Design a protein around this nucleic acid. Structure first.
Ligand SMILES: [Mg+2]
Ligand SMILES: [Mg+2]
Ligand SMILES: [Mg+2]
Ligand SMILES: [Mg+2]
Length: 760
DNA sequence: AAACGTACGCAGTTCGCG
DNA sequence: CGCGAACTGCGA
């Protein structure tokens, strides 16, 4: 099983290293024969001799063209003749490529910015994560001592915990009486002991939660101060910090650092993504969170450290359990895309599409298009196109509603109508499909590049869905549900890739053709279910819609819905399929992209509501959730009105605990780059003036106090809140937090928003 | 050296124009 | 004052 690939430079020459795990043994295979290259298109072949003489320089090394070779390939399906230029070192390509393109006889260059290790995996047809090999795993987490106004890693690490199949243990340099706690003398001995544990265990995978941005960077800075060689790699190397665009990632040579945070972020939809919320969402059991303030107080006073050690232990144990379930899912995606697990687990949907396209293009001798230059990139940003059809929702609290949607609308359209840049307006074709409204033609004589690959993706999702319904184990049912959803967003990401300004296979014509077909098919289905089956579509968004039959039983609606699915699916062509996704006894639709429904099991599912959004206090989210229950479950508008009255009265009389009034908002940039100052920016700017380090990603937890001025003038960081000297703004939390979310709900159901709050 | 898939949306805060 | 625009953050 190929784990990963990289390259090292040995005497000025690159050596490909293939990290593998075969027969329970970790092995490194060395390849010194692979040569870097890129392509160049010439006006006349006679100029290849002058192109060969082009040189460049790279930190003291003269770069020359090692060897050239003319090859016949295809560009967007059309035959093309290009020159393959070979070089000694992969870093020769960045140094010389601009000078080669600048030659007047060179029309353009291609495939000049593909990493050397990834190029090796593609050109050798090597697929990582293939086979039934078992990878050894070890999760770990750290607990630190923090104070406001300090620099990163200024305080020491207090505990290092780790967990595998043998259990979880904690290393610390203070005496904590717990059987899973090993006590050393100093922070240095604690770090060195953890380094020994990893070396003796020798795990293939190191599991963390947000280790890319916290745990590894913290251990690194501490090791520099204490003068510790943090040799976590199997080659003895230290963890290397890389920069994937605007985010940081940490690799450990010889192993795979599996950071669960970017995996869970894309796999599960949650309001917050703390480790505690993630563990409960997957396993159903709660996990206690111990904050940095309690950790600092327990360590410094010396009292209550057993609770900190248990929290640190649970961190490693929970991270291992989560890593056990999600590694096989991400391992399959690595097999599907053909990219290492380390990159796949953190890669964006766009790069996951492009890397698979790059591999398939090589297999088909298709020359890859380039990433756009600066002019073309900004040109693509300035152009857009129409998207999905969103109907203005009908007002009211409705009963006996079915939800019908397409199985995979955009991928189904791409395959059915052969939407591909190599098929767009292709001359001399014997059959083509014309997109409505936008009029783009797409050849149907041969399978397009992208349509020929989307079919296998949709097949993999249907196999996962088949095992999903058959599985009875509730856990395994949930992971497979997560897994097939990841395939859906990947296949759906092929459409968005057509409109991604940085995409190699950029095709705005392909993108708007997909959405135009999507708008036509959803509007056709809405028209047919209303005119032929007497339904009334209440709300529709892109690929699905909600609709009941006015004054019909639950059974009458279910039977007529299945009757319509038979009629409409016989009419719909190709791979397009409308599905029966659910029946809901009650439901209402506030605005576009905002709704709430309840099934026959009293399970409430919502979309775009304030309960799942950041920036609303808990007293507002909890009140909306209770109003949701009174309307959907009990059909009791008066009860929902009484709930809001009881809440606003408790707020006016200062009987609500201030912890439920905390608003959380994230700082997204450098504080100097904010053009407007809101409540969370004003609190951040005030904290930064006191020495607090505010960075992009810092979550501001503030509470609005009773006072004067704007809301930002009255807001203060909640850690500075003292209930003995501060009085929270009861009028603000009534009028601005609690009322608006429920006011819009009661208006949308057909009821006045008047007299919802308590008044004297 | 890589680099957020897309369009379609809502809604809070601030603040100036008419 | 009322409204809307700008800014801001994020949810098929
Ligand atoms: Mg790598
Ligand atoms: Mg952690
Ligand atoms: Mg654009
Ligand atoms: Mg059909």
């Amino acid at each position: 099983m190929i784990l990963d690939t990289d390259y090292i430079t040995e005497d000025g020459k690159p050596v490909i290293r293939i990290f593998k795990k075969e027969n329970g043994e970790f092995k490194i295979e060395y390849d010194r024969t692979f040569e870097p290259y890129f392509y160049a298109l010439l006006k006349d072949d006679s100029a290849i001799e002058e192109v060969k003489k082009i040189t460049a320089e790279r930190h003291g090394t003269v770069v020359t063209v090692k060897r050239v070779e003319k090859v016949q390939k295809k560009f967007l399906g059309r035959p093309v003749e290009v020159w393959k230029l070979y070089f000694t070192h992969p870093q020769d390509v960045p140094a010389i490529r601009d000078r080669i393109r600048a030659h007047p006889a060179v029309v353009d260059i291609y495939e000049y910015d593909i990493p050397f290790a990834k190029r090796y995996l593609i050109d050798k047809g090597l697929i990582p994560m293939e086979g039934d090999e078992e990878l050894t795993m070890l999760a770990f987490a750290i607990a630190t001592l923090y104070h406001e106004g300090e620099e990163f890693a200024e305080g020491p690490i207090l505990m290092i915990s780790y967990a595998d199949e043998e259990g979880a243990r904690v290393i610390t340099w203070k005496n904590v009486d717990l059987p899973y706690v090993d006590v050393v003398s100093t922070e240095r001995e604690m770090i060195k002991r953890f380094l020994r544990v990893v070396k003796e265990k020798d795990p293939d995978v190191l599991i963390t939660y947000n280790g890319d941005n916290f745990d590894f960077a913290y251990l690194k800075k501490r090791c520099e101060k204490l003068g510790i060689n943090f040799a976590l790699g199997r080659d003895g190397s230290e963890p290397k910090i890389q920069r994937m665009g605007d985010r940081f990632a940490v690799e450990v040579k010889g192993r795979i650092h599996f950071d669960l945070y970017p995996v869970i972020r894309r796999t599960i939809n949650l309001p917050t993504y703390t480790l505690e919320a993630v563990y409960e969402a997957v396993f159903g059991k709660p996990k206690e969170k111990v904050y940095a303030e309690e950790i600092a107080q327990a360590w410094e006073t010396g009292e209550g450290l057993e609770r900190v050690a248990r929290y640190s232990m649970e961190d490693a144990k929970v991270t291992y359990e989560l890593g056990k379930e999600f590694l096989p899912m991400e391992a399959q995606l690595s097999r599907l895309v053909g990219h290492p697990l380390w990159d796949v687990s953190r890669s964006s949907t766009g790069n996951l599409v492009e890397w698979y396209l790059l591999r398939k293009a090589y297999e088909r001798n298709e020359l890859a298009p380039n990433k756009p230059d600066e002019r073309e990139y900004e040109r693509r940003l300035r152009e857009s196109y129409a998207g999905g059809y969103v109907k203005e929702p009908e007002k009211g609290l409705w009963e006996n509603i079915v939800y019908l949607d397409f199985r995979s609308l955009y991928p189904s359209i791409i395959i059915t109508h052969n939407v591909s840049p190599d098929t767009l307006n292709r001359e001399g074709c014997k059959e083509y499909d014309v997109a409505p409204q936008v009029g783009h033609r797409f050849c149907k004589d041969f399978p397009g590049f992208i349509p020929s690959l989307l079919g296998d993706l949709l097949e993999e999702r249907q196999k996962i869905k088949r095992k999903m319904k058959a599985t009875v184990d509730l856990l395994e049912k949930k992971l497979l549900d997560y897994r097939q959803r990841r395939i859906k967003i990947l296949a759906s990401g092929y459409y968005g890739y057509y409109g991604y300004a940085r995409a190699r296979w950029y095709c705005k014509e392909c993108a708007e053709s997909v959405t135009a077909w999507g708008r036509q098919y959803i509007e056709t289905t809405i028209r047919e279910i209303e005119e032929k089956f007497g339904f009334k579509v209440l709300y529709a968004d892109t690929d699905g819609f909600f609709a009941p039959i006015h004054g019909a039983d639950a059974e009458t609606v279910k039977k007529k819905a299945k009757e319509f699915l038979d009629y409409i699916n016989a009419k719909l062509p190709g791979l397009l399929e409308l599905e029966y996704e659910g029946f809901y006894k009650r439901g209402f639709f506030v605005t576009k992209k905002k709704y709430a429904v309840i099934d026959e099991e009293d399970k409430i599912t919502t979309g775009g509501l304030e309960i799942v959004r950041r920036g609303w206090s808990e007293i507002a989210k909890e009140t909306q959730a209770r109003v949701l229950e009174a309307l959907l479950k009990d059909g009791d508008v008066e009860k929902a009105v009484r709930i809001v009255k009881e809440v606003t009265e408790k707020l006016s009389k200062y009987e609500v605990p201030p912890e439920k009034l905390v608003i959380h908002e994230q700082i997204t940039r450098d504080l100097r780059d904010y053009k407007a100052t809101g409540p969370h920016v004003a609190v951040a700017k005030r904290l930064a003036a006191r020495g607090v380090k505010i960075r992009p990603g810092t979550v501001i937890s503030y509470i609005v106090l009773k006072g004067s001025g704007r809301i930002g003038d009255r807001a203060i960081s909640f850690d500075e809140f003292d209930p003995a000297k501060h009085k929270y703004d009861a009028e603000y939390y009534i009028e601005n937090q609690v009322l608006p979310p429920v006011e819009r709900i009661l208006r949308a159901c057909g009821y006045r928003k008047e007299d919802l709050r308590y008044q004297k």
